[PDB]
Ligand binder design. Structure first.
Ligand SMILES: C[C@H]1CCC[C@H](C[C@@H]2Cc3cc(O)cc(O)c3C(=O)O2)O1
Ligand SMILES: C[C@H]1CCC[C@H](C[C@@H]2Cc3cc(O)cc(O)c3C(=O)O2)O1
Ligand SMILES: N[C@@H](CCCC[NH3+])C(=O)O
Ligand SMILES: N[C@@H](CCCC[NH3+])C(=O)O
Ligand SMILES: [Cl-]
Lengths: 482, 471
C-alpha cells in the first residue's frame, strides 16, 4: 500500500521497456465481438458454474480491481459503458503459445485498458465472468486511480475521473442528454423547426471578442430571442433553437457565464398556450424520467432531508404585483418608476431588512422584492409568477385587460427561475427602444404576427431532475480558476 | 413605382389612425382552426366551383398579391372575397389590406370556377401590418443575407435550402444515436485553444482572458477516457481567419469519437453516412451541382460507395515526377518542395514549414482529382498531423483520412493517438492521455459545406441563416 506517486515513474519506464522488447503497448486495433452491456444481456441467465467453452469471444474494458487469489489464478473487475463483469484468469485455460501466463498478467495494473479473448460463464459463486485464453494491453493507465469513494474540486477539473469512479456521475450526465432529447422530440412532434442563429452579433453584461480579419469588435449573444423573432417574420411559424448563451456576471450555484438555453417561438400563440405548454412539458419530462410525477430533491444538500416536488398540473400562478401588495399591506400605485412609489418600495426593502440595489430603478426594486417574498412561496410544487410590469419586461406584449402589466410568465422550482415566456410584442410603435438591433426593429416593421415564445434554462432543469445543488455538477467541464 | 420612404410613413400613419378609431391593428389572439398546408391537404380534392358553405373555418397567413394570395409555412392558397358573402363596409375593409399584411380570415373552403383552391371570407381581420413595400417575386443581392426574413418570404428555394439543412442535421443525429453514440456539450471557452488563430474574450468576474474553441476534439477525447466510448457533439466552432465562399469565422461542426475503432472503420462509416444521407434526401445516389455557378452547366456527383482513396505523398510524388525523401522537414527536401511550388507558378506560404508546403502542393494537384465523385485523401504525414496515430506499417505517415467534394474538404478523421509519450496543448488533456486512452477512431464534419453541396449553393453564406456581415 501507499505507493509514493512513483507509479508514473515505474509505468512510464515499463512502457519504454515494452517498446525495447519489440512489444507495442498501445496497439492500433482490437476486433471485438461484443460490448460489456451486451455481454451481460446475453449471458445474465447462465447457471452458477456453467461455462460455454465452445464460445470464443473478444471483449474490451478498463481494469478497475486487480484481485489475485492463488499464483496460477487471478481476478479482475472489468468495466465498460457504465457496467462491470468479473474476469477469472486461469493458468490452466491460458493459451501458452502466445505468452507466459505469469508475465502476461503480472503486467496488468488497475486502470489499464485491456482486450480479452475468452469464453463466457459463471463462477461457482454465481458471478458472471469472462475466461481469458489471452489478454492484450491496449492502453495503459500510468497513474494511480482514486479508490471507490475516493471523491472534491478534482471532479470538475478532471471529469473523466468522476465518470470512471462515481456511478452517479455517469447517471447525472446521461440524464442531461435524455432531457434534451425528450425536449427535442417534444418540440419536433408539435411541428417546430430547429435552426441555428449567430453566436456573435454587433450588439445582461456581454462577453466581447474581436474578429481579426474584420477589424470589428463583436459580442457573444446573451440570448437567442431576437433572431428567432426575425425568423417568425420569415414565415417559419414554429421555430426553436437549443444552445449556448453567454452572460458576463457572477458565478455561483445557479450561474455559469456560459449555459445551455432553449428558446422556441410559436406564431399565433397567446400566453395561455405557453402555460398549457409548460405544464404539459414539465410533467411529461418528469413522468418520462421517473414514471411518477413526484420526485425528491435535497434542497439543503445531501446531508439534509430531501423535499418532494410535485409536477402534477396544473401549477399555481401568482400575480407578482398583487402578491407583493397583498403581502406587504401596501398599494403600489402606477406608474412604478413614479417618484412616490419608488420610495414606497425602498422604504419596504430596508424596513424588512433586505439588500438595496444600486441603481435603485423601479425595475430592479420589484425584482428584489419579488425574490424575497414571492419566489419561495412554494418549494413542494413548481409554480408560475405571471403578469410582470412593462418596465420589467420590454419585449413582453401589454396585457390585454390589465393596464401597466404584460402577459408574461415565469416558472419557478424551489426558489429558482427555469422558464421565462410571454405573448411577444409585435407592434413596432409600442417598442420603446425602437422609437435593440437596427435589424430586429426593422423586421418588426415588416410585420410580426401574434406570437408567443418561451425560454428554458437547460441546466437548472437538469439540476433539479438530477438532485444537484450546484449547476457545476450538471455541466461536464465547467469554467474553473487555474 | 412608389418611394419606400413615404410608404412607411403613410402606413405608420394608417396604424395610428386605426388606434384613434378604437380599432386594434395588432390584436392579441386569433383562434385558428387550421394551418394552410392542412387546408390544402383536406380540400385538395374538391370539384371546380364547389363550395362547402356550411363549413366555417378560421385561417391565417401573409398577404402576398392583390389582384388575394395568402401564404403560410411555405405554401399558398387563393382568397376570393365576395360582396355575396361578406358579413356587413366591404370596400373599406379590404381597400385597407396591403401586400405583406398578415391577416386572419373567417371563411369557407372551396374552388373557383377555374379550379383554384381558395378560402372565402365572411370576415378578414388585420393581425400584423406590413409597414414597408416588399420585393417583387424575382427581385432578390446582399439583402438576402442581412435580412433573411425577406429571402424566406419571397424565394421558395430559400426555405427549401434551410429545411434541408435541418434535415441533414437530424439525419446525422439519428445516424449517430442509432449506432449508440452519446451526445454531449463541451466548453465554448477554454484556457488554451486544429491549427488556427483564435477568437479571444475576457471573463469579468473571473478576471481572465479565455479562448473560443477552434474545435471540439480535445474534451471529447478526455471523455473517451471518462468511459463514454461513443461520444459526439454537434455545434459551433470559431476560427479567426479568412472569409470566403467556403469559410466563416464561426461554423457548425460535428465530431464523434469512437472507442475501439480503427481508421478503416471510419472509412466504412463515412461511405455509409454520406451515401445514405444523399439517398435519404433525393432518393438517388447521384446529385447535380452547379460548380461554376448557376449561369453554367451543372455537374453530376455520384455518392455510390466505395469512394476512391488517394495517398497524399504518393500522389504529389507521382504527379511531379519527384521523390520526396523523408524526413520531410529535412533541408534537402523542403527546397525540393519550394522548387516545385514556384516552378508550377503557385503561391508560397510564410513560414515555409514542410507541413504547410505539403498542404499547398496537395491543394493544387490532388484536391481536384475527382469532382464527379467524393473521394478520400489518406495517410498524411505525422508532421502535418499531430494528433493522428502513427500508421501501423508505413513509417512517417499517419492513419488519417479526408473526404473531398468538388475540391473542398468536408470530413477529417483518423485513428487517434493515445500514447502520451509520442505526443510532441492543454496540461489537462495531456494528463488524461496518461490515465489511459484506448484505441479510438474519431471524425469531424463540416456541416455547412456538406449542406452547401446538397443544396446546390456556391456560397457558404447561402446555407447559414444570418451570416456575419460588415455593416
Ligand atoms: C434563457 C433563460 C430562460 C429562463 C431560465 C434561465 C434563467 C437563468 C439565466 C441564467 C443566467 C446566468 O447568468 C447564469 C445562469 O446559469 C442562468 C440559468 O441557468 O438560468 O435562462
Ligand atoms: C470540422 C471540420 C472538418 C473538416 C471539414 C471542415 C473544414 C472547414 C473548417 C473551417 C475553418 C474555417 O476557418 C472556416 C470555415 O468555414 C470552415 C469550414 O466550415 O470548413 O470542418
Ligand atoms: N430571451 C428570454 C427567453 C425568451 C422569452 C420569451 N420571448 C430570456 O433569456 O429570458
Ligand atoms: N479536430 C478535427 C476533427 C476531428 C478529427 C479526428 N479527431 C478538425 O477540426 O479537423
Ligand atoms: Cl491497414
Amino acid at each position: 500500500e501507499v505507493d509514493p506517486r512513483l507509479y508514473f515513474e515505474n509505468r512510464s519506464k515499463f512502457i519504454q521497456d515494452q517498446k525495447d522488447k519489440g512489444i507495442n503497448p498501445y496497439p492500433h486495433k482490437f476486433e471485438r465481438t461484443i460490448s460489456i452491456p451486451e455481454f451481460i444481456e446475453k449471458y445474465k441467465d447462465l447457471g452458477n458454474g456453467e461455462h460455454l467453452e465452445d464460445t470464443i469471444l473478444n471483449i474490451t474494458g478498463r481494469i478497475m480491481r486487480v484481485s489475485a487469489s492463488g499464483q496460477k489464478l487471478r481476478f479482475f473487475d472489468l468495466v465498460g459503458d457504465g457496467e462491470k463483469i468479473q474476469v477469472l484468469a486461469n493458468y490452466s485455460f491460458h493459451n501458452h503459445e502466445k505468452g507466459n501466463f505469469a508475465e502476461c498478467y503480472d503486467k496488468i495494473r488497475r486502470g489499464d485498458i485491456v482486450g480479452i479473448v475468452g469464453f463466457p460463464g459463471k463462477s461457482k459463486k454465481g458471478e458472471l465472468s469472462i475466461f481469458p485464453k489471452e489478454t492484450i494491453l491496449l492502453s495503459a493507465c500510468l497513474h494511480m486511480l482514486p479508490m471507490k469513494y475516493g471523491l472534491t474540486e478534482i471532479r470538475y477539473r478532471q471529469r473523466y475521473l468522476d465518470l470512471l469512479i462515481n456511478e452517479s456521475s455517469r447517471h447525472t450526465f446521461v440524464t442531461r442528454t435524455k432531457i434534451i432529447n425528450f425536449l427535442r422530440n417534444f418540440l419536433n412532434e408539435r411541428g417546430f423547426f430547429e435552426v441555428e442563429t449567430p453566436m456573435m452579433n454587433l450588439i445582461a453584461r456581454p462577453f466581447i471578442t474581436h474578429h481579426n480579419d474584420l477589424d470589428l469588435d463583436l459580442y457573444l449573444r446573451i440570448a437567442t430571442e431576437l433572431p428567432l423573432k426575425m425568423l417568425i417574420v420569415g414565415g417559419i411559424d414554429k421555430v426553436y433553437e437549443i444552445g449556448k448563451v453567454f452572460r458576463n456576471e457572477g458565478i455561483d450555484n445557479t450561474h455559469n457565464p456560459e449555459f445551455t438555453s432553449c428558446e422556441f417561438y410559436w406564431a399565433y400563440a397567446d400566453y395561455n398556450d405557453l402555460i398549457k405548454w409548460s405544464e404539459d412539458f414539465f410533467s411529461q419530462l418528469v413522468y418520462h424520467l421517473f414514471g411518477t410525477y413526484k420526485i425528491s430533491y435535497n434542497k439543503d444538500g445531501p446531508e439534509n432531508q430531501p423535499i418532494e416536488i410535485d409536477f402534477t398540473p396544473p401549477y399555481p400562478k401568482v400575480s407578482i404585483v398583487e402578491e407583493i401588495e397583498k403581502v406587504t399591506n401596501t398599494i403600489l400605485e402606477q406608474p412604478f418608476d413614479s417618484n412616490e412609489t419608488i420610495e414606497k418600495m425602498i422604504n419596504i426593502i430596508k424596513e424588512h431588512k433586505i439588500e438595496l440595489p444600486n441603481p435603485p430603478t423601479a425595475a430592479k426594486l420589484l425584482d428584489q422584492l419579488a425574490s424575497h417574498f414571492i419566489e419561495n412561496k412554494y418549494n413542494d410544487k413548481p409554480f408560475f409568477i405571471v403578469e410582470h410590469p412593462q418596465i420589467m419586461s420590454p419585449l413582453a406584449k401589454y396585457h390585454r385587460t390589465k393596464p401597466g402589466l404584460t402577459e408574461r410568465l415565469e416558472m419557478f422550482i424551489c426558489g429558482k427561475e427555469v422558464l421565462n415566456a410571454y405573448t411577444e410584442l409585435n407592434d413596432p410603435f409600442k417598442q420603446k427602444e425602437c422609437f435593440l438591433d437596427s435589424a430586429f426593429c426593422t423586421s418588426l416593421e415588416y410585420g410580426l404576427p401574434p406570437t408567443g415564445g418561451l425560454g428554458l434554462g437547460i441546466d437548472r432543469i437538469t439540476m433539479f431532475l438530477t438532485n444537484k445543488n450546484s449547476i457545476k455538477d450538471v455541466i461536464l467541464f465547467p469554467t474553473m480558476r487555474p
